[PDB]
Design a protein around this nucleic acid. Structure first.
Ligand SMILES: [Cl-]
Ligand SMILES: [Cl-]
Ligand SMILES: [Cl-]
Ligand SMILES: [Mg+2]
Ligand SMILES: [Mg+2]
Ligand SMILES: [Mg+2]
Ligand SMILES: [Mg+2]
Ligand SMILES: [Mg+2]
Ligand SMILES: [Mg+2]
Lengths: 89, 101, 102, 89
DNA sequence: GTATTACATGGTGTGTAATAC
DNA sequence: GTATTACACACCATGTAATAC
């Protein structure tokens, strides 16, 4: 699915420019892997891998785990992904 | 826009198996291929074939078409600017024909 | 749900070329492959390869990923009942393990 | 993209069951080809082949040409295709 | 100007088994 | 129990060129 906007500007640099200066060095490959999974998935259920720990947020937002409590969150509207974020929850 | 950095699907799987604590030999026994095939897949030496995508989806989740789509997009990124298409004509109206009409 | 009847993408292109009045020979000369290849593709005997998807999108429109996705979906439609996955175990929780936790 | 609802029940029989009794015999292959294109396309722009004569209706609906004045129409909402119809226009 | 196909060729994925730990 | 890789092999796509129109 298309990523329409980024809340976390480090993810934006990584996805759009391949720039790694905005994300932790130890999670660059894992974050890019999950960005590649979002960009390839045509439906939300295609992200329901158990290691991703996909679950809705409590409306319209979703969460996938990168590592430990570090997660990627986004908003699912119009079949696209909005407000991409990388936070420690 | 498009993702700048794209990884071979096998190298993504190798990082996932590392995080799951699953050896390549155990993964091969589970999905039903030899550890040689898994080793070359995880090393990014061979492509994720349609047959592998069916086996891998049964173990790692998601759909077979998702895993094959990862390989297909990766294949197209390799063949970027490697095929001269400048001589290929788009059927119908071009940019100039669309202006005059 | 999923589409019941799925066509080989080569046969789809052959029906499009016939509607456009474009011969296989001219199509081959355009996209830069021999008429033999176009003939086998349009006849559904060979697959729409990634290199072909780049050439075809430059002639018939859409994107190279679209044409390659057609072949990928078609390839899976032949195989998904031919590969025994009953012995493959899904990593994580199974159906029974999801009920016990709830 | 996912086809969520059919206004033309003949299209529904073709797409869901492979049944051809609800569409004209001359256009079964052409219709199924364009249903397969819609089902495969991840974006509306991937359908913009010049033979399809893709254009929006005058809102939120789109039109794809099958043959002559026969066309497939659908509503584009949430990245899905709704109200699939086959009509002579 | 057109479509089809045997044949030779090159590229690739897979198992077997050897090596090394 | 684990990971890698040469080697043989089967499979498949493509061009060449033949045949037929
Ligand atoms: Cl943004
Ligand atoms: Cl094929
Ligand atoms: Cl319906
Ligand atoms: Mg590869
Ligand atoms: Mg034909
Ligand atoms: Mg959808
Ligand atoms: Mg040769
Ligand atoms: Mg070759
Ligand atoms: Mg052998």
């Amino acid at each position: 699915m298309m990523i329409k906007s980024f809340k976390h500007k480090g993810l934006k640099l990584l996805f759009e420019k391949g720039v790694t200066s905005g994300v932790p060095a130890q999670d660059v490959d894992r974050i890019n892997d999950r960005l590649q999974a979002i960009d390839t998935a045509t439906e939300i259920g295609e992200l329901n891998r158990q290691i991703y720990k996909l679950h809705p947020l409590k409306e319209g937002y979703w969460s996938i785990t990168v590592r430990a409590n570090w997660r990627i969150t986004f908003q699912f509207i119009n079949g696209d992904a909005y407000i991409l974020n990388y936070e420690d929850y | 826009m498009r993702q700048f950095k794209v990884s071979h699907p096998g190298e993504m799987i190798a990082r996932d198996l590392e995080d799951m604590g699953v050896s390549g030999r155990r993964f091969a026994h589970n999905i039903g291929v030899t550890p040689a095939t898994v080793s070359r897949l995880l090393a990014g030496k061979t492509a994720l074939t349609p047959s592998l995508s069916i086996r891998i989806a049964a173990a790692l989740g998601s759909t077979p078409e998702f895993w094959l789509r990862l390989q297909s997009n990766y294949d197209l990124r390799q063949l970027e600017n490697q095929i001269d298409t400048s001589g290929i004509v788009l059927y119908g109206e071009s940019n100039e024909q669309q202006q005059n009409a």
